[PDB]
Structures are given as C-alpha cells and as structure tokens.
Design a protein around this nucleic acid. Sequence first.
RNA 1: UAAAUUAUGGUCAAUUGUUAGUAUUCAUAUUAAUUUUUUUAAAUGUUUUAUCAUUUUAUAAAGGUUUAUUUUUGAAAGAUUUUUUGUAUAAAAUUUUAGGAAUAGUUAAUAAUAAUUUAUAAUUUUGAUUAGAUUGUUUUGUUAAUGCUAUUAGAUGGGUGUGGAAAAAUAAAAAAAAUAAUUAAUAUAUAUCAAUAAUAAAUUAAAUUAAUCUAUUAGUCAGAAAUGGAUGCCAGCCGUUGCGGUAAUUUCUAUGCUUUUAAAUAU
Lengths: 194, 89, 87, 55, 116, 58, 238, 199, 190, 355, 180
Amino acid sequence: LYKGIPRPAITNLHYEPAWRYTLYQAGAHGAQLSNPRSPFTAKVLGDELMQVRDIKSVEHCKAWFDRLQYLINLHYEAVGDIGEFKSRHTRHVHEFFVAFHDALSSLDFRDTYLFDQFKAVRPPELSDLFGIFLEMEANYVHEDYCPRCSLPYSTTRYCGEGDVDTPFRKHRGRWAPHQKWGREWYDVVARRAE
Amino acid sequence: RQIRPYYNLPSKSEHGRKMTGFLTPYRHWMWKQNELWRNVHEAQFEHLRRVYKRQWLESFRVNADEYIYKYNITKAAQLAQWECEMKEQ
Amino acid sequence: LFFLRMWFLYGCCLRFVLFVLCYYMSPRLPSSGNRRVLYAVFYLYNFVWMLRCFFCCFIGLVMSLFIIEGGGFVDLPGVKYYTRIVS
Amino acid sequence: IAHWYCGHKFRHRFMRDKRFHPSLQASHDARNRFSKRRHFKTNRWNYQQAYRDMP
Amino acid sequence: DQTYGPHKSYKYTYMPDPRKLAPIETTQRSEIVPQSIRPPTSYVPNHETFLERADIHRLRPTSDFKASFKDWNDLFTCDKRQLRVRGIPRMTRDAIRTAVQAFQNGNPPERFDTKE
Amino acid sequence: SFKYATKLQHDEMRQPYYIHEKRYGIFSNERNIAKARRGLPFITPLYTKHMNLWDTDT
Amino acid sequence: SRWSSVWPNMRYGSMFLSYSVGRKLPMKGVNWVTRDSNRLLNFSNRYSAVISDIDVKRTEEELNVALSDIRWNDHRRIYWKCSFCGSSYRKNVSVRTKYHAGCNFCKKKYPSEVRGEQHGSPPVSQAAPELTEQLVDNGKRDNLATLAVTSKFYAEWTCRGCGGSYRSTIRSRTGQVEAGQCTLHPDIVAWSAYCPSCSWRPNMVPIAEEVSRSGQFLGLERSMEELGPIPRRKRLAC
Amino acid sequence: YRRMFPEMIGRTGEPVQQYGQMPIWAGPHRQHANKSEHNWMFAEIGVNVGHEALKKLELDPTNEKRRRFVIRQPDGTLRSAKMSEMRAWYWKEEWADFRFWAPQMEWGIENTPSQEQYQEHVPDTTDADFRKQRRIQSRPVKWFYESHYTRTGSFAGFQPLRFMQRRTEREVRWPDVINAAVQIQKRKPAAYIFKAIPE
Amino acid sequence: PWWNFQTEHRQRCVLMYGGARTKNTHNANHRVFIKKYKRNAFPNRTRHHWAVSMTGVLSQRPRRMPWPYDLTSLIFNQPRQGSDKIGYVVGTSMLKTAVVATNHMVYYPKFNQRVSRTKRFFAHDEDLACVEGDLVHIKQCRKISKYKHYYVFSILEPNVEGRERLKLGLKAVPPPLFGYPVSRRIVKLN
Amino acid sequence: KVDSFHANTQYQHAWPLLSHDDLGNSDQSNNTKNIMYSMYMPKRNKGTAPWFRGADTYSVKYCEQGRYEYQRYLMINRFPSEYKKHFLSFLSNIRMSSGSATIPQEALHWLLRMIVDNFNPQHVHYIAAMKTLQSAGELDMARDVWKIMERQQTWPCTATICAYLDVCVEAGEKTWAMEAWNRYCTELKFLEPGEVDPKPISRVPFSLTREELLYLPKWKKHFDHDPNLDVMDLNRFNRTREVYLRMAQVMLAGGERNAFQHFFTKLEEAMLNKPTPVPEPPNPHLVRRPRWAPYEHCKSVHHSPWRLQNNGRALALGPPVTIEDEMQSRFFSNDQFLVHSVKEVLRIVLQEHKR
Amino acid sequence: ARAVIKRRSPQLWGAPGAPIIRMRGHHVVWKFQSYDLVVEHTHKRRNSDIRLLHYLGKHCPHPQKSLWSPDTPVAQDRHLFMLTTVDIDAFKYWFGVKRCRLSMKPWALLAKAGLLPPSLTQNSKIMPKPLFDKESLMRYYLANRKDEDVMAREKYLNYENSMVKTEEERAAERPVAPYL
RNA sequence: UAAAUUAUGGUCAAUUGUUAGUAUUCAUAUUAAUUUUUUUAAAUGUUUUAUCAUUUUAUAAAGGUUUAUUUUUGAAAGAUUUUUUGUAUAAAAUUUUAGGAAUAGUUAAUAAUAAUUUAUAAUUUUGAUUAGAUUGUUUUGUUAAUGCUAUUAGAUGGGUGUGGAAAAAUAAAAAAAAUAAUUAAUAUAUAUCAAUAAUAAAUUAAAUUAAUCUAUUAGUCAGAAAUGGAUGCCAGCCGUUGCGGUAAUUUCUAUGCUUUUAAAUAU
Ligand SMILES: [Mg+2]
Ligand SMILES: [Mg+2]
Ligand SMILES: [Mg+2]
Ligand SMILES: [Mg+2]
Ligand SMILES: [Mg+2]
Ligand SMILES: [Mg+2]
Ligand SMILES: [Mg+2]
Ligand SMILES: [Mg+2]
Ligand SMILES: [Mg+2]
Ligand SMILES: [Mg+2]
Ligand SMILES: [Mg+2]
Ligand SMILES: [Mg+2]
Ligand SMILES: [Mg+2]
Ligand SMILES: [Zn+2]
Ligand SMILES: [Zn+2]
Ligand SMILES: [Zn+2]
C-alpha cells in the first residue's frame, strides 16, 4: 500500500472543490461578442448598433417580398399576353413562392432568419397570400387558353411553346398538343383550389 | 531584382559587367519616394503582425488554462480511483 | 491455369520473332495430319533464344518477323506458342 | 498465390511459409530446422571428455 | 481470365436543370476599376520606339515584331491570348506584355541593355 | 467492415495527427521539418497510436 | 496540334456541348424537311418579331439556306440582326423559339438581369437626355434611349475628343446604380467620358493641380474633405 | 401536433449580420481592391473545426469556439454566412423520416431519368408514357399545392438494382449471350435507317 | 475515383465530391524470374536463388510486426522503445562489459499469435559486479564504445552459486561441451 | 499530401459540389442529383449504396460532451538527462522568449505550455515567472502564476512564499498575503541555540528494490520530478525572517497597525535574541555560474573612434545608476537584518504614499 | 552556396529558409484546377510535402453559382461565388508569432477575407503613386498629434496584453472571512 | 450459478462461373490491369554587386544497399546596443533466396597511446559473412472476410575540408535583397514511364463562345444463331470434351442469321 512512492498531492483536487478554478472567463480572450443574440452583446453594442448590424437581413426579407408582389401584380389575371411571344403563367408566381417557402421551411437550406423579419418587413396587402392565389385560380379558368399550360388557343399549337420556364417541354422530349376544357380539367382546377 | 537603368553610371570594362549601379541624384530621390510609399504599407502590415501575436497568445492563455482545469480534474479522478483499487487490492 | 508454358513470353502478352525454319510434325493420335511448325528467334538481354511455335497464320509475299501470342493447347505436344500476324 | 514466388508449383510456397510459421520457430528444443541432416551423426566419432573441475 | 471487356457501359442522362440556367447577376471589372491607356511620352513616342527600349534580352527580341503592331492603342489593347494569335513566340510576347502593363503602372521601359 | 475502411486516406479512418503532440510535446514536429536529410526516404518517425493502446502508460 | 484536342470552356449559360463522337452520333440521325407545319413564315401570328430579326441577305449568302426553308423550331445556326440594338449574331431559331435567346447584348438590356422589369428608374431620354447624341448612329438611337438610366446595357458611343467609337456601359456612363447592387468606382463618370485611350489626359489634370498647390499629392484629399452623432459600442479596454 | 409541439417547426434563426471592416492605411489607393466581380466565401477549418460528429455544436450561436464564416459581397462589405451557406461546408446530409408520411424515394419510375432506367433514350413527353404506365400528366410545381407537413425528405440510401449493383457477374456463362442482370437492353439493328420527320 | 467502374469514368483529374485520391499501382504484372545460372554451379555456398524473391520489410508476407506489449513494457514505462531490458548475463570476457541475452516480441496478425525472439547486447558495468548467469536490468545510454549503448542499471538476481564458484578459483560456469555445428565428420579417437 | 496529381489533403474536408463548367457530365447546366448519388459520392465498394459521412450518421452523444473530457491522464516519463534539458529550456523561455519582442505575458504563456506538455513546473519556474512578471510591472499575472501553483497542489517552499509576498506588497493587497500566510507559512520557526544549522538534506532519493520494481502497479513506479518531494529540503536553510519581514510590509501596506506591530515585534525580538542562520549558497539554476573565458578577443574600448564603447573586459563608461554596495539580503547578520528591515518598512511607506 | 547553382529556381538566403505562405497546385486543364494555401519553408524539394509546416486550405478559382442557398431575388447574392477554406488559427500563429513571409496571390485572398489589408501589388492604374515632402507632412502632424499617454496606452492594448482587470473582479477574487 | 423493461439506442459484413463417375485451392466467368490509341504540359540567358574580385542562390546522372540512412541555428526567419546561456552526432523493433557454412584491418578495456598497449576477445546454425534478386515501416487490386497481391521515388567514400548544414557540375516550373508582371491559368509539338476518353455509339437539336472529331471488328457443334458449295484423316479448326472416313449443323468459302450494344484475342 504505502510502499513505492508518496501519494501525488494533486489527488486532493478530487475531494476538495476549493481547488477547481478557471482563472479566466469564457470569451475573455476577445471572443465575447461571438454570440450575436446574447444579453451581454445587447448590452455592449446597444440597440441602434444592433439595427445597423441586422439591416442586411431585413432588406433580404424585403427583397423576397417585393419580388413576390411584383410577380403577383404581373401575373394576377392569369391569361393575358404580356410580351412578344410570352404570356402570363400563374405557374411562374407559384414556383417562385415555393422557392421562398423552401427558404423558410426546408431542412437543406434552412434559412429561418427570414421569418424573424415578418412582423416588420411583410406588406399589409400581402398578408392574405393563399387568398390571392385562390383569386388567381379563378382568373386561370378562362376558355381561350389551354387549361394545362395557359397559352392561347388561336396563336399556339402546343403546350409550353415560347415559355421559358415550361415543364411540358423537356430537352430531348417531344411536343405535346393543347388539351381541351371539359369536366376533367374543370375539376382539376377545382381540386387545386381546394 | 534591383533595377539598373540605362542612365546609371556606365562602367567601361572588358573584364566585367557593363553597368555599375550608381545613381543620378534624380534616381536616388525617386527611389526615396517610392520607398516611402511602401513604408506606408509595411507599417500597417507588421502592426497587424504583432496584433495577431498577442491575439494568439491570449487565446492560448485562456484555452490552455481551461484545458488544465479539465485535465487536472481528470488526473485527480484517476489517481483517486487507483489508490482505491489498491485499498481493495 | 498452367504457368510454365509461357516461359519465353517472359511476362509479356505478345512477342516479336524472326523467321528461321519451317518444318512439319505429326500430332498425337487420334489426330493425324501435318501441323506446320515455325522455328523462330528473338533476343533478350543480348541472349539469342530459339522459340518453337505453331504456325496458324497467313503468309503473303515473303516476310520475316511474326508476332507470337499465347496459349490454349493444340494436337501437337510441346508446341506451346502460336502465331498472330506476319510482318 | 502469385505463381512466381519460390518453385513452379504451389506447394513450394507453403513449404517456404513453414519457415515463417509462428509456432514453428527455432529455439532451445527445436533447432537447426533448415538443415537438420548436414549435422547429423557429426560428433559420433568425436570423443570429448566432459568437464569436471569439481570432485 | 478476362478477354471480354466491360459488362456494361454506365451512362447518365443529360437533363438540363431549370435552376442552373437561371439568370446570373453580372458585373464587368472595367466598371469597378475603369480601364485606360497612357499617352506616349517624348521618351517613348510610338509603339516601335517602345519595342526598341523594351528589347534587352537576346532571347526576348522585341524590336523585330514592330510590323505586327499597327499603332500605339493596338499595343495596349492587346492581351496574351490575342498576342499569341499574331504569332509572336513565347517569352518574347510575355516580355512585351509585361513591358506594357509595366509602363501602365507609372514605370516606363527604362532598363540597361544586357545583350553586351 | 469493408474496403472503404481500408482507405486511410480519409481522415475518418486514420488516427489523427495531434496524438503525436500529446506524446512528444506540442509544436514538436516543426523542429523535425527543417532537418537536413528529410523525406528521402525517411522522416522523423511520427507516433500516432490511439492513446488507450499506448504501451508506455497503460 | 496536341492542344487542339482540348475541350473549350462552357460557362454557366450554355447547355449540352456535343463535342464527342458519342454526343454527336444520335443527333446525326435526325433529318429535317420543311412540310408547311414546320415553316416559320406560316406562324407569324406569334413569332412575327422573330421573323423580322432575320438577316435575309447574309444567311442565303453564307449558309445557302433559303428563308422559305427555315423551320420555326429549326436547329441550324443562322445569322440575325437585332431589331432593337442592331447588332449581328449567330443563333438557331429553335433556341429563340423554345426559350428566348436574343442578341447576347439585350440580355443585359434591363438593369439587374435577375429581376427583369423591377426597375423603378426613369429611362435615358429623361434622366440624362444629353447622352442620346453620343451614341454611335445605326438608326436605333430611339430604342436605346428607352433603356434604364441604370441599365447595364453595353452600348457603343463616339468619343468626344478623337471622334472614334468605343463601347461602355450605360450606367457606367451615367454613374447611377440601383440600390442594393454593387457601387461602381466613384470616378467612373469622368473615366467613361472618353476613349479607353483618350481618357487619361483630362482626368490627370486635377492631380497636377493638387501637386501644384501644395507640392504634395496624396489620394487622401477627397476622403479628408469628407471629414470636414455616431453611436459607438462600450469597449473592454478598461 | 402543431398545437402540442410548437417548437418542431423552427421559427427562429441566426440573423445575417454585417461585420465591421478592418481599416486600410493605404487609403483610396487600395480601396478598389476588396471590391470585385463576385461574392467571396471563406469557411474556416482547423483541428477544432469541420467535424460532422460535432456539427451542431459548431453551428451553435452560443458556442464561442464556433466555426467562423465570412462573405465579401462584390461591393466590398462583409457579412456572416446565411445558414444555407454554413451547412454547405459539411458533407451532404439526408433527412428523411418515415413515421407519418411517405418520403419521396429515389430511383423510381417517375424519378430516374431515361439512360439509367432504360438503356435507351426515351422521349419525355408530358403525355402518354406507355413504358411508365401513365395516361397523361399535368405538372404543377412539386410542393405548391400539397401540405408542407406532407413533405418529409428523400431516401437515397440503397442500391438501385436495375441500374448498378455490387459483385457484377454473368448469370449464365453459356450461351455467351447473357450478361450481369444490369445489362438489359433491346437489340440494336442492322445499320440505321433514318426517316425524315416533320411528317 | 476508385469506387467508379471501368466504364463509368469521365475525368481523370479530380474527385468531384470527396473520398480518397488514389493511384492505381498495377498489382498484377506477371513479373518473372530470369535464370542466369546452371543448377550445378550457383555462386553461393549456403543459399541458392531459383525464383522471384519477395522484397519487402514489414511489407513482407506473412506479416511480422513489432510488438511492444510483452513483459518488458509490462513492468516498465519506457521513455523510448528499448530503453529498458531485462536479461541474463552471458559471458564476461571483456573488462567492464557484460553481454546480455534478452527477449522481445513479434506478432503475426495473419495467425493472430506472438513469438519471442532473442537478441544480445553489450552492457557497460563499471566495476565488474556481474557474474555469468545473473538476471540484470539494463538501460539505454550515452554511446560508450562502438557497440555498447547499454549499461547495467541494477542486478535483479545475482548468482550466489556462481560467485561461490569463483571464490574457490573455478570458472563461473563450465564451458559448453560442443561448439557450433559442422558439415564435416570429425573422427578423433582417445 | 499537397501539390501532386494525386493529392489527398485537399479532399479531406467537406466542400460544396463544383459545377463551373463541363466536368465530363456537362455539369454546368446538368441536374446532377442521381449523378450525385450513384457516381460522385464515395461508396463502400464499387456498386454499393453511397456512404454518407454527414452530420446525421454520427450519434447524438458527441455533442453531450464537456470539453477535454476525452483526455485521459498521461504518464509520460523520460530520461533524467532529458528532464534537466527540458526544465532548463522552460526556464530560459519563461525568462525571455524573444529579444525586444517579448511581451510580459509570454512568461505566463510558457509556464502554462510547460503544464500542457505533461511536465511538472518546479519551484525555480514559479519564482522565475513571478519575478519576471512583477519586474515588468504587470501584477495580476503574477498572482495568476500563484493560482496556477495552488491548483497543481504544489506546496510552495519558503523562497516561493517570499516571491509571492513581494508581489503582494507591490500590489498592496493584504488579503492575498493573509490567505497565503494562513495556508502555508504558519508553523515556520526561527533558529535558536539548540536548533542546528542548515539542516542536512535528508531525502533518500527515490529508488526501487527488485520486489518494488516487479510487483507494484505501473503508476506507483512513476516518478516525474515532483515538487513536494524536495520541499522539506528546499527549506533547510531557514529564510523565515524574510517571510516575517515581507509580512510586516504587507500588513502595513493594507493599512492595519495591530498585525504589523505583531509581525515586526516578533521579528525584532528574535533578531536580537537568536543566532544568525547560515545563508544558502547561490542557487545554480537562477543566478547561474561564471564559466571560464579569456577576454582577449574583445572590442578594445576605443574601438569606434567616435566614442567610448563599453567592453566585456572592463567598464569604461561609468555607472548609469548608483548601486547600494551591499551583499544580498540573506548574508546579513541578525542585527544588520533588523536595520535592513526598518529601511524596508520605510521604503513601503514611501511606495504607499506614491500610490 | 552550391558550387554549380541550380539555375532555374533561385532563392534568397540558403535552405531551408524562412517559413512562407504559398499558393500552389499541380498543373492541369484549367477546368479542374485548385490551389492550396500552405505554410512551408522557402526552399522546396522535389515533392512539396517534405518541407510543409502546415496546411492552410483549398482555394478554387472558378466563380461558382450558389446552389446551396435558395435562389434569391436579392441582386448582390446572385453574383457568382468564389470558394476558399482558410485555417485562421495556424495563420495567426505562423504569421503572428512565427513571423511568416507572403507570396502575392495568397495575400490578395487573405485581403478579400479581411485578415490582411490588400497587397502592395494590387494597383488601380487610375491613380498614381503619391508624392511627399517633409514640411507639409510636418504641418499636418503638428496639427493632429494625440497625447503621449493615450498613445502609449494604445500601443499597450494592441501589442501587449488586452484582457485586463477592472476593479470589480479584483474585489471579487480577494479571499473572504476565515482566511481574511 | 438468475433471469430483466422504463423496450429496434453506439449509424448497413455479406459470397450470382453449364459443370460431366470419384478424390485434389487449377482451362472457358466478373472486377483490376498490360494488349489500346497525343484533352497538360512547356522554351532558353539565373541574378544583383564596390570589377580581372567579393556578397545572395544545398538532394532527380549511373553504380544495388535486407542487423542498412542517423544530427545542431552560427545562415534566414528575427523584433534592441554589447557581452549569454545549456540542449546534437546515440539507439530499439520489423529484413528476402527449396534443399545451409564459417566470417575478419578485425571486439573490450585503457587514451585525445599503441603500422609489435593489455586480454581466456567479436560475429555465426535463434541461419552469419560473401553471392542472387530487391529503392525499407500511412499509398494498390480482389474480397462478406483473419488473407492473398502492389506502392514510386529519393542520401553511393575520401584526397586545402568552403559553408549554419555537402545535398555542390544539364534535365526548374520554388519570383531569387526598387511593385519586372498578375486582364493570369495557352503550353508547340515534345517526351517520359504515366494521365482510367467508343464522355447522350444512334430519331425532335444544342438558354455557346461553334472550336477537336467523321469512328469499325464478334460468333454461327456443345451454348443465342444455318442453308448451298467445295474438302474427304487431307487441308484445317482447338477455351474445352473433341471435330475432318464422300452427306462435316465443329474445316474453307459464299449468303443469310445470331447477340444484354466501350471487341475480339493473348498475359
Ligand atoms: Mg510466369
Ligand atoms: Mg486439344
Ligand atoms: Mg479489360
Ligand atoms: Mg484487404
Ligand atoms: Mg540521384
Ligand atoms: Mg547483395
Ligand atoms: Mg534496426
Ligand atoms: Mg542506428
Ligand atoms: Mg572525389
Ligand atoms: Mg442452339
Ligand atoms: Mg473457327
Ligand atoms: Mg465432294
Ligand atoms: Mg456445312
Ligand atoms: Zn396547352
Ligand atoms: Zn439587341
Ligand atoms: Zn477618342
């Protein structure tokens, strides 16, 4: 037992807590403001400096929304002709909206800072969003245009002709003739609105 | 390199180099100017050198010390455990 | 797999050779005929070896060097190397 | 087994491996593993009086 | 024993991605730092005088390519790819381009002739 | 247990570097890197063995 | 030579290359005919603009390709003249019809390239109307005055000093960029006034002036005169 | 679920903030330099950083040894990384959970593009794919009309046996015709005949 | 990418995502032996070379690797491997030099088993305490002469018997009866 | 590793997938999803499902961990020779690491780093660190040295106590000096007529009988040079009077009369009525030793003919600051030390007036 | 000090020289080319690894589209990206404590990152290099020069110790009643 | 010498040949390779300086080594003046050949000794020394797997001994003491040993900048696929049992026909 060496004094440190120190603080080496959202930082920086600091995020959010309502006011009535061979597609607005909503909700991009900005950035007329989208579903059902691709019946032979973003024409795929209104697509529109 | 212009003092020799670096007072003055500019650069530069030196030394102080905290606690724990095992022994 | 029949390929898949002789030899019964055998030479590390091989090839206008290729077995016992093209 | 190590047969390889086997190694009991027979009967006719300095 | 070659040719479709073709935001570096050309000096009046004073090395024979340059602006409008187009050999052409950008920096081609 | 875990060229299959510090002192190799005869073939031997296998201590 | 074998660079714009035997061979097997359901000129109810963009003299000279022989989806690359900015380019009809493939310039036609029409900035005819005369005259000057003052469009102008032609950017000329894009060089206005060659002289004047006054030039001067309540953080220095 | 477990839908995040720039003594002479064409991402590595094992501790705002990123915008300012950018610097990670709704799975009929699924090019038309046993397809934007909780994830974690498998081998050595079971394909004809096809 | 098939390859210059950047050394070469001598005359007395020889050390099959887990590392904490050895003293014919026989360990991972090999060292003992047949503790030190890097640190077990044998004027241990083996037959009678 | 056609170090940390141009799958415009899974990602072997290295494959329990708790106690021993070499090195590094380039806080750095390397910071190191730091006039870091020494449970010898009390006085914190006193120097005595001398060195130094060597566990045989072993014998020269003196100085420094009166009275009385303790010879590891050199090749005072250069052989420039011309404080007689003590107390009065 | 100088790859001051931070990669077709920030000695051998002090990171000189982030209507963010991995602690160690050297291209990188002010070799050829004269400078300096001790305190906090002890933590660390 | 639960936790081990009584890892299979194909290299003049000099510029020629290869700061980094410190040259383990015998400027003590100091010396059968082959202890291929099977290259003695360190006699792709240059990654047609190219190998077209290329083979008894015509133990086929005897579905030729489509074939 007591043969062979004296018991190392540092053993004491196990039994008496008096000897557990840390001479220095956590970020005392110059990292103190690492935590952006710590009370300590809110005290060091003060509020207006914090505003100055997060302004970039605020204008990110504002940007997403401004794009959204530009696209809405452009494509709101779904069937018109807005350009040379190009015409309005609800689908445009739809897919942008999904991009945004993935910015918030997806687990690959998880950019959730975007949602902390809504109580300020969000436009007062855009608060209803799925309501507006419903109204668009109403406008989308006009009879001169294809139920599927929303191109005009007169001037256009195929679905997705001269649309940059079309789903219905893929690379080495083939062209698809217009589909006609009737009970099928009527209740398609129905179900989407649902 | 060290730039030797054509209007440096020419050396006439067949046994060696054709041009010795020696300066027109103009070239000397010019050199002083350009040099001053560069001085303005390295001032900030090596200033940042010693800044980072203290940064690193400080962060070492803090982290290494924390490491001694945790490690010593470990070492004490093991030593306690050992002498226990020897009481049992 | 019989690894000793390849002795004169010396670890190589194909070989070059110079023509010397062509004689004929009678295969192991019950297979009769005349099998054409070409007697060839090549050199490695300044040693000149005489390689003895089956002649299956097509000979056109008179030519010298062939390309020796590996195995399989044939009627004729002791024949191990075969001919690919003639140069 | 690569065919170029040791002899032209396989069994030659395993026969050389037996010189490297762990439980087969040379010691104070098992000696002269590689040539036992060159040393056999070597001292039969060599008469050596054993060593005694003690009565 | 493998005389037969691969069992399959593995091939992947090309299917263009809507997200990769999306319009890219672009700037030209001539906006951020504007490009300009230096007017000839009395020291260096024209492009061949330039090629004359920028000729030093035996193996960077600048002054012989005078005909591949019509003028001043053509010299400083040139870059290395387009300089290879015109068939100037290699280290020669980099001595030339080096010279030009050097003169652009406030440092004219004044350097002792090594050839001797 | 597979071929991928044979490849030590992943850093996830290999005992990390810092161990060699924990044994010989920290920043101890920067000395050895400036040595006259190095890397041809041999470098100052680099000890990385998972610390619970260490023959010395355990 | 050797290096001829090297594949070119495909930037982010371009799709499938077709540089290898495997990439050519399946398409080598498609033979087209113009059957009147294919003819471009039939479909002018839609594609009318695309019909008026075609360079009719040039295409029939170089390509030996009739204008009656052009499909609306046609894959052969033919020459075009942009009916907007008046620059010539070579594309295939297919790519202008399936997606919009323009003149490569009018790509940058609007500012920002990303948000297309979202500009709230006035046209050039308004903000700085004095730029409209400096345009090289191809006859399209009325269209290029329609562009944003902020537009990133690459336009060619006749230099004031030597009366030759160079090419710069409309917003590089104006000096106005849209909020939240990249700020340009603070001097960009004075420096795009003239040729790449002619611009040195006028802008080197104020420098010479400031070394005439104080005998000493440091680019500092502007920033210094920017100096003649700012919230600031508590510091841990104490 | 939404009522009883409000914190399973993340509503909070690390705000994108701008860093203060270091002073440049050289003044305007160099003030052009850090302003350029592109965005510049800088992710940090080191012995204490870049280990997937520790990932969340490293992206934690509360930890001060936390791995640092910076991004210089083309105008020359610098900001903290968006969380997407932060995560870009770790080996790609699969989240798919099977307990309530079916996650979208790879190497299906409608998923796999042509060349892997069949060894021929098959035309993609949005109508009448006989091979895929579908009548017609309207193609709305994928996640738009569906409920968001219904989106789960994607499972890529298995071998796609039609396409490529382990220990590839000939099923039958004789006759010489059969290959490994991944080589299915129609016979190529005697030399190709091309019919003109405007029709 | 080593995990991609022969036909799956596109670029040879880079790893697209991750993994290990590997060089394929061509392992199957059909390398061969050249026969340069007659089987009758081979230019060596003991050993003859008739086939390709396996050329590694520790690359060499079946693998035998250094094992630092035996008795010696069990009793000691060594600052550097081989800084401590326990052994028996065999012979002292050299003043202040004790020869020591010592065991160490080898591991064959193929067979998952160990062997003890043995090795001799020259130890410097100032003052000639050691007798043949002592169990001694031995340490690494200053280079002393051409071959002696070890010194006798402690005698664990002295030879009581051997010392007494010495005091009486006799050798510590009787000299071995036969020397090394021979390939000859020695006929020596009476 | 780096700069080669096959270079691993560059793929060894995670990177987002690069499509700048055609990489052979025409990555610029091509949707690479299945290309990603089947081709680009590394697999367990050719044809196996992709091996995922992502953050979700590792268990949760990696982030439940406190810091450095994965470390296990490491007994690294090394030859005696090497201990000498190493303590010396750390000493000369704590003194100064770089020429003008040394920051005071570097002393602290080097002490810490010596701990981190699994060496034991002997007494010499602590004293040296303390005197260095105090001399640079940085007073908090000196106490930090002390706190480090307490945490290692190293029993401060008398010399060390002196040093730390010097830092206490200069800082004028009585609080530190009281705890330091109360813990370590309490039982400290003076020398009386019966008491004997420098006490001889009584420690054995540590060896092993063959049965100790063979039958003990490994840790019982592990000797790192450890203070607390030699503490008894560092104190064999009785520097106590110094400790009492410093302690007086402190109780005065913090403005308390009674305590000061106590210490100074004890000291005075003992200085009059007890024998003068034999002083310790110069410590080899602090003050070094004068190795022999001929001074022959030297710069010969008039070397530069513009001025008088000082020289290693003789000092020709005259003293820059007056030196008191008294031997080190421990060589004094007892009476002399009494006097010295009064002068000390006055010096502290002065210092406190200037604070 | 070589009898016959290795002519093509000269260097200052013998081998191995100072630690220097270089950017290097094996040469290949421009499409795939990457670089390595490496702290290493001045004199390299056949393989760059023999003298390699530390590995500072990968740098890819291909502007990249950000597909990692969701496609963002903000103008700035859709500029192409340039990707670089810096190891900043070994940088601050080698540069700060060990006093490194620097090649120019790495310098430009480390400038874009905010670790270093932009290099000497980055020139807007728009402006010229400045002029100088001692008495104008002197007038400006007499106009603005801070106080002695303020400046000494600056030099203190920047170069020497930063973290300091305010009154409160002293008062918090000094021993209480039973040992006080 | 008792069970266990607050229940799938600590993150995937999984084997595919049509054979020929039977015994024995052995022909024809896949994966990896060589057969196999110009998309990554490159040209000469290193450079300052105080002038016939002096400062800076340290590991790719060959030979064949298995108890073998080991080292400093005095150079530079490098911070203020002058003195200023100590740490290093040493070892340990892993070492091939079917049939096996002695090796030698030689060990240890003395010591800045001894071509003749002293001694009962050293290496070896626990495999030495010569000799053969061979570039040593994170690199590959196959595999479900203890295995089997690769890994280049790079240190070749001394003789006015310079230099911090011999690494010092073409063969860079390392900015080398003023910011030469970074709008750069392009280098034409050479080499060495590497560096896997039939990159949608066949029908809707290239959100280009249109630049390099005009691209094919096998089998045809057994086992996907045959008819004429010759030939007649011949000529020839042959991975393999074997085929060829005037009717050969196994040879040669013509035509068709067969294939699961980076080729057959040899190693
Ligand atoms: Mg063979
Ligand atoms: Mg046969
Ligand atoms: Mg093959
Ligand atoms: Mg294996
Ligand atoms: Mg050599
Ligand atoms: Mg030999
Ligand atoms: Mg050895
Ligand atoms: Mg050795
Ligand atoms: Mg010689
Ligand atoms: Mg059949
Ligand atoms: Mg046949
Ligand atoms: Mg007949
Ligand atoms: Mg027939
Ligand atoms: Zn339609
Ligand atoms: Zn246009
Ligand atoms: Zn002009």
